[PDB]
Amino acid sequence: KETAAAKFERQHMDSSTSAASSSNYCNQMMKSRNLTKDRCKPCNTFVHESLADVQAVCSQKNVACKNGQTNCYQSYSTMSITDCCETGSSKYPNCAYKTTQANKHIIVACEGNPYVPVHFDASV
């Protein structure tokens, strides 16, 4: 099956490009990463940093997870990200998104061996 770590990468990683210099970015990425298959995932964040740099966050600032668990970590620095959220008219199966570029500290849930990101908790 798809591992939790693999899912995090498919849903949230995009090192392949430094940014989303296109209004079509989210529509294309949400679609290609299968985030529009059975429903339009409302909002989703893509991180534009190397997978290695994101994985390194798992040994950075230990902070509470949204659910109160102890395995979340916040990046010391802000990271380049793209926030994708449905437009007002977006209605499954015709998902449509608004692309917003930003730079924020990210918080990820980590697990396993190797200890890696398995959930994108939030960006602050």
UniProtKB/Swiss-Prot annotation:
Subcellular location: Secreted
Record's keyword terms, sorted: Disulfide bond, Endonuclease, Glycation, Glycoprotein, Hydrolase, Lyase, Nuclease, Secreted, Signal
Disulphide linkage map: C26-C84, C40-C95, C58-C110, C65-C72
GO terms assigned for molecular function: lyase activity; nucleic acid binding; ribonuclease A activity; RNA nuclease activity
Biological process per Gene Ontology, one example term: defense response to Gram-positive bacterium
Annotated GO CC locations: extracellular region
Tissue and organ expression note: Pancreas.
EC number assigned by the record: 4.6.1.18
Catalytic class of the enzyme: lyase
Residues annotated to bind substrate: K7, R10, K41, P42, C43, N44, T45, K66, C85
Glycosylation, residue list: K1, K7, N34, K37, K41
Keyword Secreted on entry: yes
Residues at the catalytic site: H12 (proton acceptor), H119 (proton donor)
Quaternary structure annotation from Swiss-Prot or TrEMBL: Interacts with and forms tight 1:1 complexes with RNH1. Dimerization of two such complexes may occur. Interaction with RNH1 inhibits this protein. Monomer.
Family under the similarity heading: Belongs to the pancreatic ribonuclease family.
Name of the protein in question: Ribonuclease pancreatic
Organism of this sequence: Bos taurus
Taxonomic path: Eukaryota, Metazoa, Chordata, Craniata, Vertebrata
Span covered, complete protein: 27 to 150 of 150
